[PDB]
Every structure is written in structure tokens, then in C-alpha cells.
Amino acid sequence: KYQPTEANLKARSEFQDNKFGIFLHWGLYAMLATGEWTMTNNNLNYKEYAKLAGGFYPSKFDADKWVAAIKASGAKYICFTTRHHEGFSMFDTKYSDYNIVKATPFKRDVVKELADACAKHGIKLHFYYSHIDWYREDAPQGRTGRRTGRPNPKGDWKSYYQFMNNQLTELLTNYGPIGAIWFDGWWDQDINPDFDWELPEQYALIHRLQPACLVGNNHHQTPFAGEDIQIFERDLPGENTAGLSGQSVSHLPLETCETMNGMWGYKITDQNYKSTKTLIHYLVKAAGKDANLLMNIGPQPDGELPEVAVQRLKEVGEWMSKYGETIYGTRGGLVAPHDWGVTTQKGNKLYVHILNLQDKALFLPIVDKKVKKAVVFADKTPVRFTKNKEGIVLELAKVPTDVDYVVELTIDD
Numbered sequence: 001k002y003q004p005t006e007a008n009l010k011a012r013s014e015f016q017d018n019k020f021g022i023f024l025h026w027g028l029y030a031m032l033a034t035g036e037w038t039m040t041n042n043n044l045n046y047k048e049y050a051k052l053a054g055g056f057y058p059s060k061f062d063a064d065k066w067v068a069a070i071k072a073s074g075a076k077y078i079c080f081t082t083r084h085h086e087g088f089s090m091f092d093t094k095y096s097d098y099n100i101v102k103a104t105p106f107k108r109d110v111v112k113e114l115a116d117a118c119a120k121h122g123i124k125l126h127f128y129y130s131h132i133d134w135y136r137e138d139a140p141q142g143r144t145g146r147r148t149g150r151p152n153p154k155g156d157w158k159s160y161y162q163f164m165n166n167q168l169t170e171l172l173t174n175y176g177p178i179g180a181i182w183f184d185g186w187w188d189q190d191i192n193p194d195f196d197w198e199l200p201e202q203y204a205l206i207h208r209l210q211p212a213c214l215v216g217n218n219h220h221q222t223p224f225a226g227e228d229i230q231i232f233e234r235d236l237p238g239e240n241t242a243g244l245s246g247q248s249v250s251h252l253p254l255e256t257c258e259t260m261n262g263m264w265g266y267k268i269t270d271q272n273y274k275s276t277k278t279l280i281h282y283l284v285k286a287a288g289k290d291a292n293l294l295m296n297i298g299p300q301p302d303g304e305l306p307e308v309a310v311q312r313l314k315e316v317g318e319w320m321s322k323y324g325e326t327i328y329g330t331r332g333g334l335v336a337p338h339d340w341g342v343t344t345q346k347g348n349k350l351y352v353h354i355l356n357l358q359d360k361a362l363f364l365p366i367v368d369k370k371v372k373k374a375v376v377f378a379d380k381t382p383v384r385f386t387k388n389k390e391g392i393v394l395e396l397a398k399v400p401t402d403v404d405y406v407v408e409l410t411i412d413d
């Protein structure tokens with residue numbers, strides 16, 4: 001069965017170490033500015049929808065600007081939608097003329113420009129790839145895309161499968177080293193429990209071209225053999241407030257994805273961006289649950305990242321410059337997430353992230369381990385603490401009102 005290589009295991013460790021990445025959802029749907037599900041939500045004819053590519057020209061696109069804005073947040077990788085459910089390829093593929101170079105006046109391989117900029121800024125680059133397709137006539141139809149006017153609902157699974165494997169070969173050979181392939185769409189065939197996605201062969205292909213490329217699949221299931229990371233959508237592992245994540249937590253590297261407003265693709269009615277404080281909290285709570293955070297922006301049809309999104313990124317980076325040592329290269333801390341906050345850990349250090357506390361003292365259930373030292377991370381002032389039957393009790397100088405009041409504990413062994 002699945003034997004992950006030494007390189008793959010190293011890449012899993014580096015992934016868990018980086019903690020924070022940015023999701024970019026960009027395609028033809030940015031013209032419509034009503035969301036990447038609009039083609040199926042509105043039952044748009046597939047040929048009519050394809051006509052939009054003739055008017056696609058994000059004149060202000062600047063991959064360098066994007067990646068500099070993203071790096072100023074402290075994020076270490078980008079996950080970019082190379083091709084979403086709409087079926088439009090944002091890269092110069094030779095297996096379909098329905099792509100940004102051939103089909104639009106822009107005539108520019110957006111994916112290549114991104115990969116170059118990412119390489120220049122030392123930001124790893126992951127590729128989102130859609131297992132389902134609402135445009136191609138050989139794509140089989142599950143629950144979505146049943147009213148786009150296509151002629152063969154059953155599709156030609158052999159043709160379409162060969163097409164995906166050839167495009168993945170393109171993406172893995174032409175754009176230098178690729179952090180991960182992020183598959184999505186599996187849930188589209190869940191109504192058909194016998195649907196054979198032929199995943200062993202595809203994962204084998206990916207690992208055969210680049211053995212350190214991680215493989216994820218947003219299937220909301222217990223991971224399948226050959227996957228290298230587990231995806232939780234709009235929820236933290238073991239949580240299910242958004243209704244998409246009832247699956248158990250595995251021993252694979254965990255990653256949570258989330259939007260900065262309410263949608264993945266650019267939405268012109270939706271300018272309700274979460275505060276900087278909410279965003280830092282998402283990141284820290286994820287780290288405290290031993291998971292990465294993948295935070296999304298939907299770029300505009302003129303090619304600029306939304307301005308408010310960029311300012312949020314800038315302010316999150318201002319916080320990260322001060323507190324990143326408590327997040328980077330850590331794992332889920334020895335003390336489970338509580339209502340007051342979370343803990344992370346690295347070496348002999350356990351970081352207590354006090355996010356939400358009304359008191360001037362905090363009880364921690366640390367029994368076996370001995371707490372050798374306790375200081376305020378920000379300036380290294382003492383934290384008095386007393387042992388008791390069930391743990392320790394920190395005595396704080398004030399009721400914390402910071403975004404994250406971090407106390408650094410040194411433990412033995």
C-alpha cells in the first residue's frame with residue numbers, strides 16, 4: 001500500500017512548520033462577481049458562459065504585487081486555483097483551448113507569473129485542481145452542473161480522466177517545484193457510492209513526478225491511502241459548526257481553510273471582511289489544534305487583490321513580526337484548546353495564548369510535566385505561578401485585553 005518517501009515526510013514536517021498560507025480563488029467568475037458557484041447556481045449555458053473569456057482582461061494584475069502583499073502577512077505559501085468547477089484553466093495548457101492564454105485577450109499564463117514571483121519571494125506554491133467540471137462534455141455529472149445544457153450527462157470518464165492526468169503532468173513539469181496538489185470535487189459523486197475516482201493511479205503520478213509534493217483531497221472523509229495532508233473546510237479538526245466536517249482526525253498534517261469575507265471567489269456585494277483580531281484568532285486557534293490555516297482572498301476581475309484584504313494582511317503581518325516565534329515551527333500544545341485560548345509548543349517551550357480571559361489568573365492542568373519557568377513572551381517579565389493538585393495557576397499582572405496575551409513556559413524534558 002502507501003509508502004511515503006523520506007522526501008515526502010520531510011515536506012510534511014516543513015508544511016506543519018509553516019502554519020499559515022493564503023487561498024486565491026480566481027477565474028472567469030470574477031467577471032460575474034457573484035461567486036465561483038454561479039454557473040451551477042444560475043443554470044448558465046456552458047457555451048454562453050464560455051463567451052465571457054473574450055472579455056477577460058485583468059489589466060492591473062501584478063504577480064509581484066500579490067506575492068509581496070501576501071508575504072507581508074507572514075504567510076509562507078499560496079494555494080491558487082489553477083482550474084475550478086467552471087472548467088477554465090488559468091494556465092497555458094495544450095489539452096484545452098479554454099484557458100487564459102488562448103481564449104482571452106489577456107494572453108498571459110497567470111500561473112507562470114505567480115510561480116516566478118513565489119520563487120522570487122521564497123513563498124511555496126500549491127495548486128488547487130477541480131475533480132469536477134461543468135464545461136467539458138466528457139465530464140460526468142454528479143449532483144452539480146446538471147443544467148448547463150451539456151449533451152451527455154454520463155460523460156466519457158476515460159477521456160476526462162486522461163485529460164486531468166495530462167493537465168496535472170503539465171502543472172507538475174512546467175512550473176518548477178510545487179508544494180502541494182489540492183484536489184476538490186469528490187463530494188460531487190457521493191450520491192454514487194460506487195464511483196471509481198481512480199485515485200491510487202493519480203496520486204502515484206503526482207508522487208512520481210515530484211515525490212515531495214503533498215497530496216490533499218477536500219473529500220470531508222477519513223483520508224485515502226496516498227494522501228499526505230487532511231483538509232478541514234471552514235472548521236477546525238473535530239469541530240463541525242459550518243456543517244462540512246464530521247470526519248475523524250487522522251495522523252496526517254491537518255489544514256483548515258476559511259474565507260476572509262464570506263465567499264471564495266470575488267463577490268461585489270460582499271465587503272464584510274473579518275477584523276484583524278478575528279483573523280489572528282483563526283490562525284492561533286488553528287495552531288493550537290495542531291493545524292495550518294489557509295485564509296482566502298478572491299481577486300477582482302481587474303487583477304487587483306481587494307484593498308481591504310491587503311490591509312488586513314498587512315496588519316496580521318504586523319502582529320506576526322512580534323509573535324511569529326509562538327506559531328512558526330510549533331505543534332499543537334500539550335494543553336487542549338479552552339475557552340480562554342490555546343497552547344502551542346516547540347522544543348522545551350509551551351506557549352499559552354490567552355485570547356479570552358476575564359480574570360487576573362489562569363489555571364493550567366499541567367500535572368506530570370514540571371514548569372521550570374514562566375514569563376510574558378512580549379517583554380520577558382515574570383509570571384508568578386503556584387502548583388496544586390490538578391496543575392498550576394498563573395497570577396497575571398492585569399486582566400488581558402490583548403489580541404493574544406502570550407505567556408511562555410519552559411518545561412523540563
Ligand SMILES: C[C@@H]1O[C@H](O)[C@@H](O)[C@H](O)[C@@H]1O
Nearest residue numbers: 036184185218233257264
Ligand atoms: C475550497 C472550497 O471548498 C468547496 O468544496 C468548493 O466547492 C468551494 O467552491 C471552495 O473551493
